[PDB]
Structure 1
């Protein structure tokens, strides 16, 4: 699986950066959220504890899976802004 970043936006009204990317993975299943987040943090040199993956969407009959994620400057702002369900899904919140 190869990750290619299609768009980076710097939102500072909310202290975050929005990342739109794609995963090229022919002949393989949809990558797990853990693996996607790990590779994204490794490539972008981000903080693992202040980044979330909004979604990883696999299309029909395609080897490209689209992906949307965010990276926050501060964990406090991350918790304040992001919903609880997405944090639970990403595993940041033990719940």
Structure 2
């Protein structure tokens, strides 16, 4: 019984996407996960679910309505080109470095000590 409407619809020809406001009615039951939103937006606009990036849902008080922002890209390469790399990482097709920034700071400051090729000899 999950209805999903689209609102304030736009076509960015300059970012190669559709972008719209997803409006999910689901009275009685929990906030529905993004996977059910993507799969319903997919068959709503007759597109692959892989090009659909869906985020920023804040459920109204009472909870028979959530409003989030969606966008449907033209291709897979267009998705991976001009999308925030963190929102790719919800789909597993961006992985970032394990290091926390304090190691990278202290590394940089240790490399500032030695001159020449010996800066590679700070770590390992």
How many residue pairs align between the two structures?
94
Post-superposition CA distance 1:28-55 (Å, at most 9, x none): 1000110111111111111222111132
Instruction: Indicate the structure with greater strand content.
Output: 1
Query: Following superposition, which runs of at least 4 residues in structure 1 exceed 6 angstroms of deviation?
Result: none
TM-score, with length taken from structure 2 = 0.68
Distance 1:30 1:62 in 2: 8
Aligned residues: CA RMSD = 1.6
Residue 31 of structure 1 corresponds to which residue in structure 2? 32
Distance 2:9 2:48 in 1: 16
Residue 93 of structure 1 corresponds to which residue in structure 2? 93
> Gapped runs of 5+ residues in structure 2?
96-124
The question of whether the paired residues in 2 share the 8 Å contact of 1:50 and 1:72 is answered with: yes
Distance 1:74 1:4 in 2: 23
TM-score, with length taken from structure 1 = 0.87
Question: For structure 1, which segment, 77-86 or 51-60, has the greater mean C-alpha deviation from structure 2 after superposition?
Answer: 51-60
> Gapped runs of 5+ residues in structure 1?
none
| Shift, 1:24, TM fit | 0.7
Q: How does 1:1-95 map to 2 (within 5 A)?
A: 1-89=2-90, 91-93=91-93, 95=95
The question of whether the paired residues in 1 share the 8 Å contact of 2:54 and 2:70 is answered with: yes
Distance 2:63 2:50 in 1: 31
Distance 1:30 1:18 in 2: 21
